[PDB]
Design a protein around this ligand. Structure first.
Ligand code: A1AUX
Ligand code: A1AUX
Lengths: 301, 302
């Protein structure tokens, strides 16, 4: 029993973290096979980040203008390229600790573990959700760029995120491992608007099932609802619309608890309209939306 | 910016997790040098846990009755001994992945990372606080016993906790790495009272400092208090009394934010007496106490 925000064991990813330096700038890199991936803004100086011309800046750089360090040992760059917003520094030696890996571009509402790093060294690990507005609510300080997000499937590491910036509003933005930003963000020191964020409805319902499995049932009510009627309330409270796909994804949790998905929706409608009235669910005074149905199943089983 | 419950990277601990089987019972073990550490209840059957005589049960066990497996590598058990509530199985080979380590008995209020494991395989990592009543609020299922809690200092792993049981109340109990339980708990399937739990006051104040560093300052007030005055409110609200030692440990955060500790105490007093009025602090509608002043410094600067 007990329900916790749980990150994946980070060992397979720790062995891939390197320090990347280009002039005065030092950030983190991911060494997989003979390639080191890192944010391309590593090639920018203070007077460049307002509107950098990355193609021009990268031309002024040579393979030897990048110092890559894995622990104490220095790696040698034999070819540099730019793929969207990521720099790919090809090194002469393959990382012997390269795990079985995949690059995946996750969907909003999905979760992953962040291995926060500083100077190529892992500092901590925590679980994040990709918000519906494509930002993440992380914990990042200067030097944390190049830190990655990932999921594990048995022995396969699926890398899905690379940290690129903290927006002026304190929220975090980054790319997939092909350098494509999640959301409308760009790699420049400019005020950028994140969309209106919404609550991940299917994740709140999954967490309500996690609470039922762990003994917290006070919120289960005599009322019920329809999918279209529930969405009327959800739209008022800035919750993302619930589809039949979301109901289907919730099927295994519904079966384990004996609680119909629409009945759990009925309980959630009353929690939104009437609030929690100073009560807690799984140790929280707010409705939690950063656990997917898969996160609940794998933690409870 | 941002504030999160952050665990230590678990790689150095993953290389130490093994599977330990004794008859039908399988749980996790910790392999450091040529010793495998695990809960002594591994030698019990379902109908032994009511009141086991561990010394008598262990006498019926020989080295070959313990099957120890690190991945697919089978370890050969050449010695066995019981130290308090842990079994120490001597194996014929040193773990090549043994990191630099220490065994520590943490104090109540201190935090640590838990690497939850099943069948000797790691499944997740999360941070826990050793509650003032010596329980932890974790996430453990059947098969999780033998999972460890730890802290990392540079390259050194300080193992502080081994999981042994979930009480009927749903909370978790275990030992340090010398097999001494935290709290009054025993390793038997019996109803056991965890005392009244109290809130770690120094940790709540540290998190209020973390909130101010992150821009959350609505709760800051034009009031001040004294140590004894604050403590009359802390005793009313089941918060542990604040001492000058806690004040001193908060020193760095007070210096960084420019907010005196007794002034932060006055804000906490107003929050205890008036609630949060439906507002949030660092993404929470509750006062948080599972972050120490060290956890705040490591994250807010580091
Ligand atoms: C990242 C790096 O490590 O190089 C760090 C990251 C950052 C900075 C400060 C606090 C947290 C945090 F995650 N970061 N944000 C922005 C940038 C950057 O290179 N440029 C920049 C500056 C200001 C606003 C937007 C922007 F893109 C970095 N660098
Ligand atoms: C642990 C093991 O893996 O052997 C598992 C742990 C447990 C059980 C169920 C849910 C969560 C959880 F952490 N556990 N709790 C108790 C015990 C045990 O061996 N005996 C027992 C049973 C009930 C209460 C106390 C008690 F000691 C285990 N074993």
């Amino acid at each position: 029993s007990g329900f916790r925000k749980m990150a994946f064991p980070s060992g397979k990813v720790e062995g891939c973290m390197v320090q990347v330096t280009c002039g005065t700038t030092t950030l983190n890199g991911l060494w997989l096979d003979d390639v080191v991936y890192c944010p391309r803004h590593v090639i920018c100086t203070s007077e460049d980040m307002l509107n950098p011309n990355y193609e021009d800046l990268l031309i002024r750089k040579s393979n030897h203008n990048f110092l890559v360090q894995a622990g104490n040992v220095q790696l040698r760059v034999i070819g540099h390229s730019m793929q969207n917003c990521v720099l790919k520094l090809k090194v002469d030696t393959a990382n012997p600790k390269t795990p079985k890996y995949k690059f995946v571009r996750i969907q909003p509402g999905q979760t992953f573990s962040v291995l926060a790093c500083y100077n190529g060294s892992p500092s901590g690990v925590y679980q994040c959700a990709m918000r519906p507005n494509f930002t993440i609510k992380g914990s990042f300080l200067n030097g944390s760029c190049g830190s990655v997000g990932f999921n594990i499937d048995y022995d396969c590491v699926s890398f899905c995120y690379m940290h690129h910036m903290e927006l002026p509003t304190g929220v975090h933005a980054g790319t997939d491992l092909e350098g494509n930003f999640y959301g409308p963000f760009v790699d420049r020191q400019t005020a950028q608007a994140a969309g209106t964020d919404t609550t991940i409805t299917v994740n709140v319902l999954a967490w309500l099932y996690a609470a039922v499995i762990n003994g917290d049932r006070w919120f289960l009510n005599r009322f019920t609802t329809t999918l279209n009627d529930f969405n009327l309330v959800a739209m008022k409270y800035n919750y993302e619309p619930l589809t039949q796909d979301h109901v289907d994804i919730l099927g295994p949790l519904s079966a384990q608890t004996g609680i119909a998905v629409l009945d759990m929706c009925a309980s959630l409608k009353e929690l939104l309209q009437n609030g929690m009235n100073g009560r807690t669910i799984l140790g929280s005074a707010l409705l939690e939306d950063e656990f997917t149905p898969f996160d609940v199943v794998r933690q409870c089983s």
